[PDB]
């Protein structure tokens, strides 16, 4: 009963159509957030909902990392750790990657073009590979 | 890097509140849902604590999904109990704090929340020998 993208005019399916390879690495997203928007990230401002989403994603994923470390330390059985860390890192982190890329892109170029990029990418992917144009559309600037 | 900064509060200001005197999870869930479902469901975008609560509920949903998945697989029975107990007890303190804060401001007004939060620090500091019997409630 929650549509996080509904507050910006997008829906879950729009991003769900996006394959996993397209999103960057988590380290890349964190480094971008640190380097390019640190000054105003901590400062207080009105509106700017994207700032609030980024701030809460960073806390959520920090808490997840703390969980990973805590399970690594204790957890005496030797095997479980592999499965636990795999599920925590690769599977659960997909949503974090999903949200971080969406909001970071929204901040740099705004809703005006990201939505069109999404609809165009969906149109490109839906068709079969045989008649698909050479390369995937690029967001560009 | 600061959970609340932009509400005129600090993580150190909430320290005075003891961990035990918080409310239970399901109560905050119900209090938010029943009262402010309509507020959740609107096209208007303002008071970012709305979105903040939307992030908190999403995080809780993800954690519950992890809990059920662990309940499903994970062959040692114990490790399972240890993980379930940890996720239930230790993992929810921060979310509970967030829900309390946002509901409080969401219910009445910010200034009333900031007053209650600085005053409640008085209660713990005073000694029981001459401390007043009752503690301060948010009221309205």
């Amino acid at each position: 009963d929650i549509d996080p993208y509904k507050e910006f005019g997008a829906s879950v399916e729009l991003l769900s159509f996006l394959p996993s390879d397209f999103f960057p690495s988590i380290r890349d997203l964190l480094d971008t957030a640190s380097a390019l928007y640190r000054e105003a990230l901590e400062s207080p401002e009105h509106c700017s909902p994207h700032h609030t989403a980024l701030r809460q994603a960073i806390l959520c994923w920090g808490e997840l990392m703390n969980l990973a470390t805590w399970v690594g330390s204790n957890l005496e059985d030797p095997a479980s750790r592999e499965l636990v860390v795999s599920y925590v890192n690769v599977n659960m982190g997909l949503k974090i990657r999903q949200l971080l890329w969406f909001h970071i892109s929204c901040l740099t170029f705004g809703r005006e073009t990201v939505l069109e990029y999404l609809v165009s990418f969906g149109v490109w992917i839906r068709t079969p590979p045989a008649y698909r144009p050479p390369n995937a559309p690029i967001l560009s600037t | 890097i600061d959970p609340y900064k932009e509400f005129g509060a600090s993580v150190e200001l909430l320290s005075f509140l003891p961990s035990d005197f918080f409310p239970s999870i399901r109560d905050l869930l119900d209090t938010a849902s029943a009262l402010y479902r309509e507020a959740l469901e609107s096209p208007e975008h303002c008071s970012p604590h709305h979105t903040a609560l939307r992030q908190a509920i999403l995080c809780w949903g993800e954690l519950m999904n992890l809990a059920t998945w662990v309940g499903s697989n994970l062959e040692d029975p114990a490790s399972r109990e240890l993980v379930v107990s940890y996720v239930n007890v230790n993992m929810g303190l921060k979310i509970r704090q967030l829900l309390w804060f946002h509901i409080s401001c969401l219910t009445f007004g910010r200034e009333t929340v900031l007053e209650y939060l600085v005053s409640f620090g008085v209660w713990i500091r005073t000694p029981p020998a001459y401390r007043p019997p009752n503690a301060p409630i948010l009221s309205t």
Partner: antibody
Amino acid sequence: QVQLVESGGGVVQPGRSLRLSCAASGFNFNKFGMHWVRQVPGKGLEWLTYIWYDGSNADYVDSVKGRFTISRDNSINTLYLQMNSLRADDTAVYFCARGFYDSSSLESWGQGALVIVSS
Amino acid sequence: DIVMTQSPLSLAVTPGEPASISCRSSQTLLHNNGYNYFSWYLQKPGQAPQLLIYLGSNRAPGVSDRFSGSGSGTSFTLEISRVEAEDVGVYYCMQGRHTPWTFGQGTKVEIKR
């Protein structure tokens, strides 16, 4: 309930080396560890070695350190314990077991097999 | 590495009376999970060993309630409320805090002549 049956036990001439067979079925071998237990008559149980599911790591006790080795073949789900440089103090019945109460104490114990050396 | 210890070595019980056996370990077994890694085993002549208590204070599945134990840290005790004729055997305690694993010395029970 899982049932494990060993094989290969018997008498061996002194100075040679022997290999014992311990196969298991009815549970996920790839998801649990294995252990070796020994009992010479007159004393109690003694721990020898163990191997993890992957098999990359292993441990040994000082009594047989560097002279025994253990390996597993996940294709057929069978345990293996190799014995070299056998001595008169090694005459005992050998048991292979499995532990799953959070990786601490053994749960199901095999029937075991006795190994005897003499001329 | 760990030195194990058991006492008393022998204990003959008139059956129908309670009895207690004590096993002691040198190094503490309280891990950071609030659990203690200690075991209770039962061994019968001509048979494979069987489990008595698991994780220090939890009964192994299928074991009768007649056996109970508790304790923490470096001290533990095995208690049997009522002794039955089928309870004769040699009992063991084991350690699983740090590798390598070490066993105790044993405790055999019988009937007082």
